[PDB]
């Protein structure tokens, strides 16, 4: 099984070199199916970078972003927590050996039966943002530790009037008092700025709002110790607002509003930060059309029903990269890239500039780790691309250092 | 109602005087207290057989080739295979699925114009001879990997008025069609017909007439270069439920005279279609449970159900679907209606099924029904966030099974 199969990365070789080698080797007769190269060492590097940048914040990996068993196994060996939204994710995380106290059930609107499953398996900490959720928790998980999720404003969100999650401050006061009535323990506050954040100052505002709700809990007699700053941190360097800028703003705000002497425990729920850049996708040009100055339509063997669903669900913009480095002098033409399916909406790239390519040539898409395979379907019978996991020796030694 | 082993091949009886809606009500009443209220489908295979009867009566000259991609459930493919229709397959997996149920290759058309070489080789290995194409590079690939194939040229259609358009992605113009036919002649590749798709949701039937006229022209083009053109494929786009402005019979009313005018039966032409939505749309009804609730202060409601845009309701984005929630429990005549929104289970803020609708106040544990959820819903659902696909319960009455026996004979 390829899920638990890991390949060695030789010294002086990078995931890109491994990808090039695979492409060169299958060039004669093999079927040229799309495939991923996933560098678990990149995930270890991301964890090291997190420990260095946010020393007070325990990372809880958002499983929904990429639920690959290899990823969860590596992060579990790293002693990080896990953010789980459903019974299946809890089963996946526990099957690898993670104890329940390293799991947060961070879905604010949970089906009763899944709250029951969480209670049966010892997962005590859950989020909430509504009174009906308090009713359900009192009925199905009365001894749970609840974290109140508060609303954060995202100005660039598509639907600003209808917000799926998050209590306002005014609603937060009533929720805290109602939880007091039901003898339900509320232990903290969570918020999610989102991956669309353009100014880091929003984090500060969110932290300030969290402090406010913390004070409210003290007024109602609750003991508030848990602060959850959620996710949205970038997973690659190909972004305007980089991880270190965000952390640089976040650390002073944490020190100001939640000093360590208060006893607060600060955690986060990063998903794309850990895995985005670890996965590179290779697709093959399976068909070609020339439209008359000269423009091209290329059809590749992965699409919007597959890995590129992130184009619609995750508002992703994908940049095709040529596997064979192109000499500058050769002419570039206007081109479009399409998926394999018979749907006319299965279009990966509307317009881009590429040299003339041919059927059997390969295209690479970097930073395809996040919200790509996790949401892929088998529409039209096209199977999910095989994922090849690689890890160097030194990276494995680093993982061993973490396991201790 | 409880599935016996595996849903895929398990079918339940429909008693006399009972419809699919009645069965859905019985299942909901059964699970009123103890059971976990997971979302589920009721799929009436008898409705699919009735659709086949209606097709035979409306388009007697057109053999239907079911578009497996629309709903690839083994139960549907088995029922249609017993019906003796053809199958339109887009990939190796679909061909494997159809052949595993026992369908011979001459009842399969490989109607993907842009196929991976290895899948063309798989089609050649398993005896699937008929494939579509619309490009020169496709001719090069077929000459290399499937030289004895019977090729059908897919032409462009004016589908701007259609809900779902495949024109930009696929379809050769008449000008390009001439060059493609001559190129196929050079490569000694046999071209036997023409296919076209007017779009999944065309508003004006007249488009079919123009499409048929275009096909006639390309047929004549083939006659000029020495091809014997006999196969006409009029594609899909027929509505699958009565909840549409343009009904099936209007479209067939327009189509049949056009077929008689441009492709008379004495010419020897064989006419086929590739309907997917028509056969399965209304056969599936989806029941979801209200798993969470919020009240927003005049009074408005947000309901959270256990299926979403990553699941069955992906048709909202991919298929441009408009979904109408129906209350399982009949509403009181005078009870008040409130502005409400309906949301999916996942932690994604975009997982919204219904932005705004009017519903009476509902509670956690209540059920919501969505009719006509057969087409392009389960076929494209994912397990994002770990939420599983809803269980499908297949039902069939005795008379429906008798009708299936009639078709088989």
Swiss-Prot record, chain B:
Pfam families: Orn_Arg_deC_N, Orn_DAP_Arg_deC. The keyword Lyase applies. It is an enzyme of class 4 (lyase). Its EC number is 4.1.1.17. InterPro entries: Ala_racemase/Decarboxylase_C, De-COase2_C, De-COase2_CS, De-COase2_N, De-COase2_pyr-phos_BS, Orn/DAP/Arg_de-COase, Orn_de-COase, PLP-binding_barrel. The record marks 197 as: Stacks against the aromatic ring of pyridoxal phosphate and stabilizes reaction intermediates. Catalyzes the first and rate-limiting step of polyamine biosynthesis that converts ornithine into putrescine, which is the precursor for the polyamines, spermidine and spermine. Polyamines are essential for cell proliferation and are implicated in cellular processes, ranging from DNA replication to apoptosis. Belongs to the Orn/Lys/Arg decarboxylase class-II family. This is Ornithine decarboxylase. It comes from Homo sapiens (Human). The gene is ODC1.
